[PDB]
Amino acid sequence: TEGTNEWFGVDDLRLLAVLFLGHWAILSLWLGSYGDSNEDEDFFGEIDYSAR
Amino acid sequence: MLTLKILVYTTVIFFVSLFIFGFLSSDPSRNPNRK
Amino acid sequence: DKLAFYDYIGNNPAKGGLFRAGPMNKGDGIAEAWLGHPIFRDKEGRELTVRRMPAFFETFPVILVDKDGIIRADIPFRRAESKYSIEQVGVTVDFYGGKLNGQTFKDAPTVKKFARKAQLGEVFEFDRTSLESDGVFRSSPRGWYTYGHANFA
Amino acid sequence: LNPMWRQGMFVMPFMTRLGITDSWGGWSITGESVSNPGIWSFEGVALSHII
Amino acid sequence: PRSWLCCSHFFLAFFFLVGHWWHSGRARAAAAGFEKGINRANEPVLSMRPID
Amino acid sequence: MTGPNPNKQAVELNRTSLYWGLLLIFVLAVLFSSYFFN
Amino acid sequence: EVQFGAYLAVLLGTFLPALFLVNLFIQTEARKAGKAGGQDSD
Amino acid sequence: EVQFGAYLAVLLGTFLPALFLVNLFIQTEARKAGKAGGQDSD
Amino acid sequence: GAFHVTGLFGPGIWVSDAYGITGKVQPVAPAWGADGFNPFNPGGIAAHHIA
Amino acid sequence: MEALVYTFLLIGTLMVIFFAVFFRETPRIL
Amino acid sequence: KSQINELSYLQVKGTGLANRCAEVVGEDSIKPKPGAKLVDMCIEPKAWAVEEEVGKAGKTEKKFVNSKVMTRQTYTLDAIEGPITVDGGKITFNEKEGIDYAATTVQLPGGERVPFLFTVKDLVAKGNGDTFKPGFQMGGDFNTPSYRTGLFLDPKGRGGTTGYDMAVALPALQLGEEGDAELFGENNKVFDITQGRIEMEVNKVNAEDSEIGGVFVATQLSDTDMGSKTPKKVLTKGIFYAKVD
Amino acid sequence: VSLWERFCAWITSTENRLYIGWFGCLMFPTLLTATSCFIIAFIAAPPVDIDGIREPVAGSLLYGNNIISGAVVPSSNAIGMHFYPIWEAASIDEWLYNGGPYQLIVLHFLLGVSAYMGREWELSYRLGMRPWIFVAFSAPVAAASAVFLVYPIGQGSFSDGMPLGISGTFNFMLVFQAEHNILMHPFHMAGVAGVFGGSLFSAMHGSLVTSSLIRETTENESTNYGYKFGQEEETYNIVAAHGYFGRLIFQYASFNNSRALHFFLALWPVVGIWITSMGISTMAFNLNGFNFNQSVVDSQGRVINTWADILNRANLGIEVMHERNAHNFPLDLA
Amino acid sequence: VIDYENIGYLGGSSIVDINNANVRAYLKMPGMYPTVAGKIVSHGPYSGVADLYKIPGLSSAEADVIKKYESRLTAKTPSPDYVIDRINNGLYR
Ligand code: CLA
Ligand code: CLA
Ligand code: CLA
Ligand code: CLA
Ligand SMILES: CC(C)=CCC/C(C)=C/CC/C(C)=C/CC/C(C)=C/CC/C(C)=C/CC/C(C)=C/CC/C(C)=C/CC/C(C)=C/CC/C(C)=C/CC1=CC(=O)C(C)=C(C)C1=O
Ligand SMILES: CCCCCCCCCCCCCCCC(=O)OC[C@H](COP(=O)(O)OC[C@@H](O)CO)OC(=O)CCCCCCCCCCCCCCC
Ligand SMILES: CC1=C(/C=C/C(C)=C/C=C/C(C)=C/C=C/C=C(C)/C=C/C=C(C)/C=C/C2=C(C)CCCC2(C)C)C(C)(C)CCC1
Ligand code: OEX
Ligand SMILES: [Fe+2]
């Protein structure tokens, strides 16, 4: 079944758990440094050199 | 054939997520000017 | 036999190729005898000459032309709407000289076989099993000498 | 009447000695047809000794 | 009129993709300071590792 | 990389041992050709 | 009828090992001309 | 059917000129190791 | 000898009959006695690499 | 038998591409 | 079915449903009328087998190895019409129109690709008794046309009803008294008609809906490319479905 | 300190042998899969139904080809524009028959080349360079996406896409001539001027530098060893090469500015290939080149032939012969 | 076929074949294309010009234009590759 109008080509239910665990497994890596930072600290630059 | 297919969506959104969260990783600040 | 042997398109140096190699006898084999000079006549009786292949054309359609240039017969590519086929016109072949000296073939299977080999100049019997002759024309030493010493210069 | 030892196969009787009969073409040395040999066929072993 | 629209808005839509490449190469480098060229006093390649 | 190897040596072959090794190959080429062409 | 893989056996059995032994002689004479320091070392 | 003199054309057209260019590099490095005077000149 | 040959975790050895008609890859159980040193016994090969 | 030569020319060409990238004569200032 | 007819076109397409014959429900008897005409006979094979030389333990008797179809979903016949004539002893069927050929290609062990035209052209079915029953079983011969119509051009440009008739880039072959008669077989393109024998078997009937359906088995001969090779015997099996009206 | 920051520091390090970057996260997996499938499909791949008429066209080396004739065949006419991966093929044998690996190679190629292009940007950012080498590389990316992607879209099938080979290229160029008349189209005209001009100004600039080199070597050693790497002295008299070309044509046609000179070398080809790759694109949607057939007539009205009528009879020969079995109806709409 | 007899009776000899000619061959006869020529080409093998009157669904006007050209119509041996492409053989002006 090729020309089915299914979201992201997700034919079976098993392929979702592949997608969610791919974006989140790197998201959780990303939040280990850029997450848990101050969401209220600004700049009047064009580009921020805040921290790591 | 639905076992290979699972293996591809792992490999695609592994590297696509490294791409997406690469430029969200304060990527303009990685220059030889400062920091 | 020597004079008709020059009247043959396989002895033209402008028929060979570059990356095919060896003598011209690798082309179609060592010549044995002259099969003769076929003369084509229709059921009306007029003389038809086969239009000859130029040196440019690797492939050329077999066309039979009378004395004034009118297309009288051919071998058709598209056999459906055929208006000048050999079956309609009824072309008979007559040999003169050579080893087919007095012979006449009248049916369309045999006349088509001699109409194809008559656009290649004269008609010869070759021996293609001695040198494993594949079936494509080579060039004379006139052609090779002109190749080197003009790409050198 | 034409086994692998008539066709001069040298290393091929060493693959079939330890348990490789199928190939990706679908043929087999035992003659029984196969739908899928998986990874370890004759082509899979040859390509893995290259890698 | 389909072949005029599919060959002219398609024609432009590549050059505006080139406009994304020009104007963002300059804007990312104008934010960083080196859009005018390399400094002769401070070249960044000379303060790196051996080349290999 | 790491440092330069102290086990670097040089290879030598004088003019004498050239003609031995050339003649060794051509005579083995003369001998074994007739069998290879069969 | 001869085997057409024998031309490749002989003419590479000549040339490939014989061109090898030439190379060990040329670099031998280059090292001797290398140390000698006159007109050829460079 | 291919021409059996083409194996000799290609495999000597590879090896004979390519083994030539190796020799000019080996004697180049031997002259550089020849002048340098350390552990490899001899 | 314990896994590839005996077919615990493997295909086994190509065995055959006495006259080369039938032959197939199958697991081979080891022969531990003096019959293991009969070299035409495929069980001696399994008993060797295990022992 | 004929295609064996073509394959050897292709992977032999990809060898000298490999050695030219990784074993290149690294240029040095001074 | 009527369940297939419930759907619209956009729900069927891309799903591989239009390839599949219907499933008839239940079993009873139905009687063919005097003017009875068969309406929607579809035939779809579910397995293929090519007769080969099989590698048994010591023997090489001819057996059928199966094969995987490689043309994707284009194998089913459809819309086959025809009147059902009533002979006294046995009910008969002769097909008239409809899509009664479906070209397809299967692959053997070894990598050999065997195309074959799967067809039911000029079918003369004959089955025991008069009324269609779950024990009913009809079959008969059909004529296979050639896989290529005579104006097909091979890679050199030679066909049966068009094209050249000599090796067009080998101009020195037609030299001598013999000409190119050594390669004569590859110049003469012969349109070939062979025979095939299908055997159908009704086992499930609706009489309130006048639609039958059961299992068949068909054997025929593969193609030869107008005398280029020896054709091979092809067996196939599947299910059919028909509307008896 | 974190694991991600120690990974971003490595993947954006210029101290690697080859810079990987964030585009290399999807350049390297894409182009190694386009490569490793190409080498297998070029060497060992069974024949492919390209015309959709179940006449399989051989394209690999094991099925009797060479470097010139062997080619990765485009996908079937039966598939056309449909996405055909391995898992939507029910076997690999059904995949390789219908033109499987043409879509796997091309789609991993165009992602990897559009990521190789962004990778040339990224390293220019991390090295302090002005950024626009990747804009010059947009010109072959425009042309690669024109014959593999855009032309199969507007013609509605990957079977009209370009065959990955050498003889398959000239099957592509000639059939494109008969159906679209590219030579009369002014965008192939504007890129023949781009590469004839490009190879002119290449060999014209490369000669005037090599002409005006300064004496730094002897006549025994090589000319090239008068350049020490990383030196700050200029290695050629640019006033000398300006006075030469200032007399070879005339004075005012010569760039004394070496920056404006080295910009014109980047302008002329790249603009010539942007324009050309939007010639294939506008001819993908059947907006063909010029057609001057039967344009010159006498006062009686009889057609007087021109060179375009002789060019037309060459186009009619390829049109009536391309895909000699695939057609059934009098007009090649595809 | 290399050497096929009755090439002339197909389209161009102005004496047409029945069971092998294209429907374009009956265009040269005024009155028969497309209706009367459509029935001749559609049905199966004929053995003579008398079998042209055996066509199911003939009028007196459809038999009239056959009666005119019955000297020009003639029937030959059906070679089965020409009998398929009788409606359309891929020839277009
Ligand atoms: C001016 C030079 C010249 C000319 C015109 C000829 C002409 C001829 N020679 Mg001859 N020959 C020559 C020099 C020449 N020879 C030399 C110098 C040698 C010694 C090696 C020979 C050895 C020789 C032999 C052994 C034979 C001939 C034969 C022949 C005849 C047919 C050759 C043929 O088909 O070409 C074949 C066509 C080509 C080879 C292509 C030409 C070269 C192309 C353009 C490639 C150019 C090289 C390329 C750029 C480099 C690629 C390198 C790469 C592989 C790494 C013909 C009359 C044959 C014959 O019939 O004799 C009885 C034969 O048996 N010759
Ligand atoms: C459960 C017990 C057990 C069993 C059943 C076996 C079973 C076997 N062993 Mg094994 N083995 C075992 C335990 C066991 N092993 C243990 C615990 C060890 C100690 C690690 C060994 C060490 C061992 C060795 C070292 C050898 C065997 C061999 C064998 C095979 C004997 C039959 C045969 O073909 O030999 C044939 C018998 C011989 C080849 C005799 C060897 C004598 C040599 C060849 C004399 C010549 C030497 C000279 C240099 C040759 C040049 C001279 C020339 C002029 C002739 C058989 C598979 C033999 C084997 O693998 O061969 C297939 C073998 O060589 N075994
Ligand atoms: C990482 C790089 C990469 C990329 C980009 C691709 C890309 C592709 N591969 Mg490939 N492949 C790769 C690596 C990669 N491959 C590797 C390493 C291997 C070896 C194992 C393979 C082996 C392979 C095979 C064997 C095949 C493919 C195939 C494909 C194609 C379809 C696969 C698919 O369904 O994607 C999955 C994609 C998605 C689910 C989409 C992800 C996109 C995300 C969601 C971004 C979108 C953002 C979103 C719009 C934001 C919305 C916001 C909201 C608020 C609106 C596609 C071109 C197939 C093909 O080309 O067949 C023709 C095929 O058969 N690949
Ligand atoms: C004097 C004759 C002449 C000349 C000079 C040209 C010139 C040109 N023609 Mg043209 N043409 C001519 C006659 C001519 N034509 C005739 C007579 C015909 C009719 C048969 C045509 C039909 C024709 C067609 C049909 C097309 C052209 C195209 C082109 C352009 C080709 C440039 C190109 O594709 O590079 C651009 C570069 C690429 C496409 C390559 C991209 C490669 C990517 C970036 C990377 C690949 C990397 C590789 C895989 C690995 C690298 C090495 C590795 C080891 C690392 C150029 C303007 C093409 C065109 O219009 O542009 C698309 C085209 O499609 N011509
Ligand atoms: C009295 C009588 C008897 C009566 C008869 C009358 C009579 C006498 C008639 C005769 C008159 C007659 C015809 C004479 C006219 C003479 C004449 C002009 C004839 C020639 C005919 C002709 C068609 C000429 C036109 C062709 C012509 C020469 C065109 C020039 C083309 C042109 C302008 C090119 C410029 C291209 C260009 C911008 C190049 C620069 C870019 C480039 C990379 C260059 C490299 C480079 C440049 C540098 O700059 C420097 C610095 C460096 C480093 C460097 O790399
Ligand atoms: C797959 C890759 C293929 C690899 C192949 C490449 C290697 C092939 C060549 C290597 C072997 C080279 C042998 C060099 C030979 C060599 O250089 O000799 C010199 C060498 C030792 O010489 P010295 O120790 O004096 O060396 C001093 C050094 O400065 C140089 O070696 O002698 C030997 O090793 C033993 C003598 C063999 C000499 C040959 C004696 C037999 C004479 C010939 C008989 C033929 C005539 C018979 C008449 C009937
Ligand atoms: C295989 C082949 C072939 C053949 C070829 C040949 C036969 C070749 C040969 C060649 C040759 C055979 C060459 C040679 C050359 C040489 C040279 C180049 C030399 C040089 C010399 C010198 C160096 C000298 C020195 C000296 C001395 C010794 C003394 C004094 C001093 C001097 C210096 C003078 C052909 C193509 C046919 C075909 C195909 C294949
Ligand atoms: O597929 Mn490839 O080429 Ca484009 O035109 Mn239509 O389609 Mn087919 O014909 Mn012509
Ligand atoms: Fe420059």
CB atoms within 10 A of CB A45: 9
> What letters, b where the CB count within 10 A reaches 16 and e where it falls short, cover L322-333?
bbbeeeeeeeee
Token pair for K64:
């059928």
CA–CA separation, L243 vs L212, rounded Å? 11
Q: Which amino acid is at D43?
A: E
CA K177 to each of CA C62, C125, L187, M5: distance values in angstroms, whole numbers, following the listed order: 18, 6, 56, 23
Question: What would the DSSP string read from start to end of M6-42?
Answer: -SHHHHTSSSEESSS--TTGGGGSTTTTTHHHHHHHH
CA–CA separation, G36 vs G30, rounded Å? 10
Length of chain J: 30
- Of M4, L275, A17, L201, whose CA–CA distance to K191 is shortest? M4
Residues ≥6 apart with Cβ < 8 Å to L220: none
K105 close to K70: Cβ distance less than 8 angstroms = yes
- Of H16, F21, F11, whose CA–CA distance to G24 is shortest? F11
K217 close to K13: Cβ distance less than 8 angstroms = no
Q: Which amino acid is at L83?
A: F
In the three-class reduction of DSSP (H, G, I as helix; E, B as strand; rest coil), residue I8 is classed as: coil
- C-beta atoms of K171 and C136 within 8 A: yes
Residue nearest to atom 43 of ligand 5 (CA): L201
From the list E6, E38, E49, the residue facing L15 with the nearest CB is: E49
Torsion of CA L66, L71, L76, L82, to 10 degrees: 160
- Of L144, L155, L255, whose CA–CA distance to L205 is shortest? L255
The preferred substitution site among I37, I38, I48 for testing ligand 2, maximizing ligand atoms within 8 Å of CB, is I48
- Of C86, C81, L327, K191, whose CA–CA distance to M83 is shortest? K191
Task: Give the chain M residue whose CA is nearest to the CA of K146.
Answer: M81
Residue nearest to atom 13 of ligand 1 (CA): C148
DSSP tag of L226: G
CB atoms within 10 A of CB H23: 17
CA–CA separation, M6 vs M20, rounded Å? 9
CB atoms within 10 A of CB L163: 21
CA–CA separation, C31 vs C127, rounded Å? 6
Q: Is C113 on the interface with K (CB under 8 A)?
A: yes
Q: Which amino acid is at A35?
A: G
CA–CA separation, L18 vs L120, rounded Å? 12
Residue nearest to atom 20 of ligand 3 (CA): B8
- Taking phi first (over 0 means left), then psi (-120 to 50 degrees means alpha), and beta for anything else, what does residue M21 get? beta
Q: Which long-range contacts (CB under 8 A, 24 or more apart) does C71-79 make?
A: C72/C42, C72/C46, C72/C48, C73/C40, C73/C42, C73/C48, C75/C112, C75/C115, C75/C116, C76/M7, C77/K162, C77/K163, C77/K164, C78/K162, C78/M91, C79/K161, C79/K162, C79/M4, C79/M7, C79/M10
Based on its alpha-carbon atoms, the radius of gyration of chain F, rounded to whole angstroms, reads 18
Cross-strand pairs, K77: K43
Chain A positions touching E32 (Cβ under 8 A) are 47
CA–CA separation, A48 vs L137, rounded Å? 30
In the three-class reduction of DSSP (H, G, I as helix; E, B as strand; rest coil), residue H27 is classed as: helix
- Taking phi first (over 0 means left), then psi (-120 to 50 degrees means alpha), and beta for anything else, what does residue A11 get? alpha
Residue I30, classified by CB atoms within 10 Å of its CB into exposed (0-12), middle (13-18) or buried (19+), is buried
Cross-strand pairs, K66: K49
Alpha helices for chain L (secondary structure H): 5-11, 28-43, 92-97, 100-126, 133-136, 138-145, 151-154, 167-180, 186-211, 238-248, 258-280, 307-319
Q: Is K169 on the interface with C (CB under 8 A)?
A: yes
CA–CA separation, B13 vs G15, rounded Å? 54
Token pair for D37:
């040999």
Question: What would the DSSP string read from start to end of C55-116?
Answer: SS-SS---EEE-TTS-EEEE--SS-SS-SS-HHHHT-EEE--SGGG-S-EE-SHHHHHHHHH
Q: What are phi and psi of G8, to 5 degrees?
A: -70, -25
Question: What would the DSSP string read from start to end of K126-138?
Answer: EEEBSSB-TT--E
Q: Which residue has the tokens 């099938």?
A: L157
Q: Are strands M16-17 and M73-74 parallel, antiparallel or unpaired?
A: parallel
CA–CA separation, B32 vs E44, rounded Å? 6
CA L39 to each of CA I46, L64, L145, L165, L234: distance values in angstroms, whole numbers, following the listed order: 41, 16, 21, 12, 45
Based on its alpha-carbon atoms, the radius of gyration of chain A, rounded to whole angstroms, reads 19
CA–CA separation, C48 vs C71, rounded Å? 9
F12 close to G28: Cβ distance less than 8 angstroms = yes
CA–CA separation, M30 vs E46, rounded Å? 93
Ligand 8: nearest atom to the Cα of L175: 3
- Residues in chain F whose C lies over 2.5 Å from the next residue's N (breaks after): none
J9 close to H11: Cβ distance less than 8 angstroms = no
CA–CA separation, L298 vs L293, rounded Å? 14
Residues ≥6 apart with Cβ < 8 Å to C138: C16, C17, C20, C21, C22, C23, C24, C26, C27
M7 close to C82: Cβ distance less than 8 angstroms = yes
Provide the shortest C-alpha distance from residue E13 to chain L (in Å): 10
Sign of CA dihedral G13, G14, G17, G19: negative
Question: What would the DSSP string read from start to end of A16-28?
Answer: HHHHHHHHHHHHH
K100 close to K119: Cβ distance less than 8 angstroms = yes
Q: Which amino acid is at K22?
A: A
Q: Which amino acid is at L308?
A: A
Token pair for C61:
């359609």
Residues ≥6 apart with Cβ < 8 Å to L228: none
CB atoms within 10 A of CB M25: 24
L162 close to L170: Cβ distance less than 8 angstroms = no
- C-beta atoms of M92 and L330 within 8 A: yes
Based on its alpha-carbon atoms, the radius of gyration of chain M, rounded to whole angstroms, reads 12
Ligand 1: centre distance to CA C21 (Å): 8
Q: What are phi and psi of K242, to 5 degrees?
A: -150, 150
Residue nearest to atom 61 of ligand 2 (CA): I39
The preferred substitution site among H3, H4, H7, H12 for testing ligand 7, maximizing ligand atoms within 8 Å of CB, is H12
Name the helix (H) or strand (E) containing L90: none
Length of chain G: 42
Provide the shortest C-alpha distance from residue G18 to chain F (in Å): 6
CA–CA separation, L40 vs D46, rounded Å? 14
Task: Give the chain B residue whose CA is nearest to the CA of L9.
Answer: B30
CA–CA separation, H27 vs G26, rounded Å? 6
Residues ≥6 apart with Cβ < 8 Å to M42: M87
CA–CA separation, E16 vs M19, rounded Å? 64
CB atoms within 10 A of CB G34: 25
CA–CA separation, J24 vs J14, rounded Å? 15
Secondary structure of chain D as H, E, C letters: CCCCCCCCCCCHHHHCCCCCCECCCCCECCCCCCCCCCCCCHHHHHHHHHC
CA–CA separation, H37 vs H25, rounded Å? 19
Provide the shortest C-alpha distance from residue B1 to chain E (in Å): 36
Torsion of CA M7, M10, M15, M19, to 10 degrees: 120
CB atoms within 10 A of CB K161: 23
CA–CA separation, L323 vs L178, rounded Å? 12
Q: Which residue has the tokens 């019409």?
A: K81
Residue nearest to atom 57 of ligand 3 (CA): L107
Q: Are strands C71-74 and C30-36 parallel, antiparallel or unpaired?
A: unpaired
In the three-class reduction of DSSP (H, G, I as helix; E, B as strand; rest coil), residue L72 is classed as: strand
Provide the shortest C-alpha distance from residue B3 to chain A (in Å): 10
Whose atoms come closest to the Cα of L255: which ligand? 5
Touching subunits for chain F (3+ Cβ pairs under 8 A): G, H
CA–CA separation, I16 vs C35, rounded Å? 66
Question: What would the DSSP string read from start to end of F20-33?
Answer: HHHHHHHHHHHHHH
Chain A positions touching E31 (Cβ under 8 A) are 46-47
Whose atoms come closest to the Cα of L324: which ligand? 8
L71 close to L168: Cβ distance less than 8 angstroms = yes
Cross-strand pairs, K114: K106
CA–CA separation, C7 vs K220, rounded Å? 55
Token pair for M49:
């010009």
CA–CA separation, K3 vs K11, rounded Å? 13
Cis omega before residue M34 (within 30°)?
A: yes
CA–CA separation, F10 vs H39, rounded Å? 8
- Of K56, K28, K18, K2, whose CA–CA distance to K136 is shortest? K28
Q: Are strands L56-57 and I23-26 parallel, antiparallel or unpaired?
A: unpaired
In the three-class reduction of DSSP (H, G, I as helix; E, B as strand; rest coil), residue K234 is classed as: strand
- Residues in chain E whose C lies over 2.5 Å from the next residue's N (breaks after): none
Q: Which amino acid is at L79?
A: I
CA–CA separation, H18 vs H12, rounded Å? 9
Q: Which amino acid is at J12?
A: G
Q: How far does Cα L227 stand from its chain's mean position?
A: 34
- Of L259, L219, L218, L221, whose CA–CA distance to L238 is shortest? L259
DSSP tag of L211: H
CA M24 to each of CA K76, L325, M50: distance values in angstroms, whole numbers, following the listed order: 34, 21, 22
CA–CA separation, G5 vs G13, rounded Å? 12
CA–CA separation, L151 vs L286, rounded Å? 10
- Of K85, K152, K151, whose CA–CA distance to K124 is shortest? K85
CA–CA separation, B12 vs K68, rounded Å? 31
CB atoms within 10 A of CB L198: 18
Token pair for J21:
């990238």
In the three-class reduction of DSSP (H, G, I as helix; E, B as strand; rest coil), residue F9 is classed as: coil
Question: What would the DSSP string read from start to end of G1-42?
Answer: ---TTHHHHHHHHHHHHHHHHHHHHHHHHHHHHHHH-SSS--
Chains L and E touch (3+ CB pairs under 8 A): yes
Q: What are phi and psi of B12, to 5 degrees?
A: -70, -60
Report the number of secondary-structure helices (H) and strands (E) in chain B: 1, 0
Cross-strand pairs, L49: L56
Residue D7, classified by CB atoms within 10 Å of its CB into exposed (0-12), middle (13-18) or buried (19+), is exposed
Q: Are strands K138-144 and K194-206 parallel, antiparallel or unpaired?
A: antiparallel
Residues ≥6 apart with Cβ < 8 Å to I10: D19, I3, I4, I27
Length of chain K: 245
Touching subunits for chain A (3+ Cβ pairs under 8 A): B, E, K, L
| Helices L138-145, L100-126: inter-axial angle, 10-degree rounding | 170
- Of K201, K200, K202, K199, whose CA–CA distance to K29 is shortest? K202
- C-beta atoms of M5 and C79 within 8 A: no
Ligand 2 pocket check for I44: Cβ under 6 Å? yes
Q: What are phi and psi of M74, to 5 degrees?
A: -150, 155
Token pair for K16:
């591989």
Ligand 9: centre distance to CA L265 (Å): 9
